[PDB]
Design a protein around this ligand. Structure first.
Ligand SMILES: [K+]
Ligand SMILES: [Mg+2]
Ligand SMILES: [Mg+2]
Ligand SMILES: [Mg+2]
Ligand SMILES: [Mg+2]
Ligand SMILES: [Mg+2]
Ligand SMILES: [Mg+2]
Lengths: 140, 151, 126
RNA sequence: GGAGAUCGUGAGCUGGGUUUAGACCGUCGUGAGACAGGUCGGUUACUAUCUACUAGAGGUGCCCGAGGUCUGCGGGUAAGC
RNA sequence: AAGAGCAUAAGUCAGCCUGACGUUAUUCAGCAUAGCAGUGGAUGACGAGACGAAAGUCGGCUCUAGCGAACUUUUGAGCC
RNA sequence: CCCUAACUGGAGUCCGGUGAAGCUUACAUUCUAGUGCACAGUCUAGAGACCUCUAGGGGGAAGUGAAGACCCCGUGGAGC
RNA sequence: GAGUGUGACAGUCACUUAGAUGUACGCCAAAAGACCGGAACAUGUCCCUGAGUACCGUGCGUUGGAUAUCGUGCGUGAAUCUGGGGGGCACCAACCUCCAAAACUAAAUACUCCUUGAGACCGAUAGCGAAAUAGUAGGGUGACCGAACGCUGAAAAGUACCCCGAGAAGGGAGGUGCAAAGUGCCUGAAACCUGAUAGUGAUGGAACGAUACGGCAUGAAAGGAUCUCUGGCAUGAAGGAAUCAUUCGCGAGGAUGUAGUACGAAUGUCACUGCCAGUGUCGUAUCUUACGUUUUGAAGAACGGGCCAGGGAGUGUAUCUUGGUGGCAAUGGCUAACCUUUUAUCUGGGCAGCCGAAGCGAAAGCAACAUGUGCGCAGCCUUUUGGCGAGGCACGACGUAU
RNA sequence: UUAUGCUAUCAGGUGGAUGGCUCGGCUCAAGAGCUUAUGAAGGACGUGCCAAGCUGCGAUAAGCCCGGGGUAGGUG
């Protein structure tokens, strides 16, 4: 706190001088009392008692990097000028493997001919790419 | 303290541009009669004695600032004298060279003077006490080497 | 510009913002144009809530040759198909490149103040 | 006769009682221990600063200077029952 | 229990029945105003029914008491 | 003890020498009543009171000594 | 031109500094010689390759180690290249991977008695306890506890001689010195004590003061000089008479006129004057029962302080959240360690990683609007009533769990 | 000449604050890093012309010998 502003206040913003003694003025140390007197506070701060679900091992579980077809479509020219994609007879050839993405999702619009090769596609990504005139290629 | 490299470079560029404004430099405390910014031919970097630097600074109308720093050197007040900060020194002139040259030693002993290269240029040399407007002599090599220095 | 406005101005550290606020209020006076006083009040507001408008909003809400004044920064997310003149406090590099290639102008608040002091036809974007 | 005065009065006294630590009897409790029963034993600190009072002095006030003899505003008495 | 409700009935008897149903959303009120839980109670939705010409009524027994977190175990259905 | 008296030595008293300590926010010559956290030298209204010093016993300063050891409280101890 | 010393502030007086030199014993050390020797393939009823070991059972400790840490107590206990171990419960199979139960091994790392350097550090009640005759004096049987004390002056020039005094004390006088600074001696506060001066004072009432007005004293500097004193004149807000006349009232009195007059805070102006402001003390008048605290309530017979001086209490690391001000900004932000230091700065590197970028779900898993509609603030346009309307608000649609 | 006192200032005493000074402390960095039976560290006692403490030294005792640096004073 601003120590200088409280020089002369005696209690220094604490109320009574009998405040500010120990953990008794906080109701205990840490997040104690979450079943008894900090029960509602535990609900508010998310520390309510209980267990839920199970964790799978990190060595089998995996998350996939994603990119929506709108993001690919409306910055594909930047990808070609940066080298990560090429234009073959007018069709953008994007390989998500060198982008670090493994699943194409279907959010957005596809306005150009995208020939996209990726480890996985959502169904909607499939229709949006194929209706734009392009195709989807799985990574063997 | 941490300052991001981008905003630190922005501050350095701002301080470099402040060496060109006569109002900031004269308001900063310097005494000079030159026209800013002061760019010197590269042969200033090859001169090796303090007397040669004196002749150049007098021909440039900058030596008055060096004399101001020399005669304005004053014994400070308080405990700093016992701790080793006996004097309160003034800052006069910043010489920036293209690379490590004899002008670093030659201009080194001038009172209030800092002589550095473009690589060793930071905000505190260009804004002593956080105040920009340092009277500085750039060389041709320094100006050539400053093209993408902090951008 | 009473004590509240003075608190907000004295709070700011960027001299460009201070000079802009002062000159905008002067211009709102002289030109009789509440657009400039409005921009000054938006600049006096806390800097954490400054406008950071992407290119996509500009493209979505503007027509050809539509003059926009953004009391903040223009960012580069999105595409810009039509030319548009944009007066902003600052621009991203990508925002500048996109606006330039689309055929628009990236001018500052001072430049737009000098171009038309009355603020006629100017639309504020946040 | 009765009652009040910090159930007046321990910087006055006393210490029999209650109200520490020991122990016995009865009762209670499994017990440690307890009892509003009883019993035996059990440290009473201080040089008075102020104030109040009891007496004894030195001053200053009043005042020709001094001395003597008086008066009596008042205070007290139970001076007797 | 206490208070409230009920008469072509919310009472009595009889016929047929099992809605004393699975899932689910809100809003009340415990906790006026004004945060707080397990719950409880009103109004709905989905899916199946009982009675009844139909309208309806039925989420027990006219309304307000008869109950309990987390963790743990056991049980039910199908899954991970 | 009735009921105290006289006397003896040591203190005290007075003188010379030596020479501490303990109470203390201040002021302070008080007394009565009221008032006020309902137990006042200081507040209120009265009544008194010229100052200084000495001796004296302790009425008062809810005198001084000791963060009550009785009682309760503390999610404080210890022993049993 | 770092700095320190020198009779006051020093680049040029001294030591230094920048920069060069030299160095016994040692340490590293390249050319060049002497020496044991190294690396592939073919063939395989061939030989060897670590035992109370690995593993397992059970108990306990320990661990994040969960039926899946490591240890070690008891018990049990293998195999031999056609072999053995591991791959987070056991076993089977596949695949991948290694070869224990024997041994050594620089560097990168840690630390600070010690050396050097440095410092937004402390500055003698601080900083180490110790500015060290300091773990000392002193305390405790002992384990152990543990202080205080810095400073004359440029130079001792450290006071000759004389008088008093019992004096090898001390005082006086007289010297030294720019200055007594006169030896625990720089400066030399307060409490406390002695004396002087001013005011007051032996008839007097107590939070020790505030306010107003007076007496006495002071009022050199730093405060005033149309300032102080005393009056005149002009204008004067609120307010506002006296006296007299008439009338009303039982009466005290009221009303009307005189009179919104004379006056009136003040504001100007003209004279006069030599004080005034301030300070100390005392007096008269009014007011106030200290201060801090605990308290519903404090002057309390509630707690705290004899006094004075000095010391004496919101700090750092990590992490989360949030404000003000900034940099950059979805083609995002920032780097960490570390390297570059030519002595901690700094400059340039450093993409590992973190946060954002897609959510929902216990999990398997699946995976969304670059705007479809409406209202509408600011702003702009406008016929001043409407229009457009970023942001905002309200829907609609969609992803996923149920 | 009103004592005992009270208030303010001044002079002096006491005292040791304040200021100024500091060969000390503290912290950080960079180095360097074992020693003792060839008797260490540590302690006791002694050791000086006048010397009590500390420091140094060990009956050769604030010291002895040799080489180098230094050079005109030295005797903590
Ligand atoms: K000097
Ligand atoms: Mg008594
Ligand atoms: Mg409790
Ligand atoms: Mg030098
Ligand atoms: Mg000390
Ligand atoms: Mg210390
Ligand atoms: Mg202090």
């Amino acid at each position: 706190m601003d120590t200088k502003k409280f020089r002369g206040s005696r209690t220094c913003g604490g109320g009574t001088h009998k405040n500010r003694r120990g953990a008794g003025n906080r109701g205990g140390r840490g997040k104690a009392g979450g079943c008894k007197h900090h029960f509602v506070r535990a609900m508010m701060r998310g520390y309510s008692y209980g267990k839920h679900g199970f964790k799978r091992p990190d060595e089998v579980s995996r998350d996939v990097s994603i990119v929506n077809v709108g993001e690919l479509d409306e910055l594909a020219s930047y990808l070609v000028e940066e080298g990560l994609a090429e234009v073959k007879d007018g069709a953008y050839h994007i390989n998500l493997e060198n982008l670090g993405i493994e699943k194409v999702l279907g959010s957005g619009r596809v306005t150009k001919n995208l020939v996209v090769t990726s480890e996985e596609f959502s169904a909607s990504a499939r229709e949006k790419i194929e209706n734009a005139g392009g195709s989807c290629i799985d990574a063997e | 303290e941490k300052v991001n490299t981008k905003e630190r470079r922005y501050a350095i560029r701002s301080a470099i541009a402040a060496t060109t404004d006569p109002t900031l430099v004269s308001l900063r405390g310097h005494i000079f009669e030159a026209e800013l910014p002061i760019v010197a031919v590269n042969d200033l970097e090859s001169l090796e004695r303090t007397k040669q630097v004196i002749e150049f600074l007098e021909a440039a109308g900058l030596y008055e600032d060096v004399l101001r720093a020399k005669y304005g050197r004053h014994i400070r007040a308080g405990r700093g004298k016992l701790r080793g900060r006996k004097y309160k020194h003034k800052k006069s002139v910043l010489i920036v060279a293209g690379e490590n040259t004899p002008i670093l030693k030659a201009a080194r002993n001038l009172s209030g003077v800092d002589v550095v290269t473009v690589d060793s240029l930071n905000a505190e040399l260009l804004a002593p006490g956080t105040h920009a407007g340092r009277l500085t002599v750039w060389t041709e090599s320094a100006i050539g080497k400053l093209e993408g220095a902090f951008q | 510009m009473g004590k509240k406005s003075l608190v907000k101005l004295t709070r700011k550290t960027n001299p460009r913002i201070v000079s802009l606020i002062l000159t905008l209020k002067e211009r709102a006076n002289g030109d009789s144009a509440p657009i400039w006083k409005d921009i000054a009040k938006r600049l006096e507001a806390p800097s954490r809530n400054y406008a950071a408008v992407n290119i996509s909003k500009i493209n979505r809400h503007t027509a050809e040759d539509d003059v926009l004044l953004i009391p903040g920064k223009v960012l580069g997310a999105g595409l810009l198909d039509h030319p548009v003149t944009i007066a902003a406090l600052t621009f991203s590099d990508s925002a500048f490149e996109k606006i330039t290639e689309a055929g628009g102008k990236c001018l500052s608040l001072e430049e737009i103040m000098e171009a038309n002091p009355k603020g006629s036809g100017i639309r504020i974007f946040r």
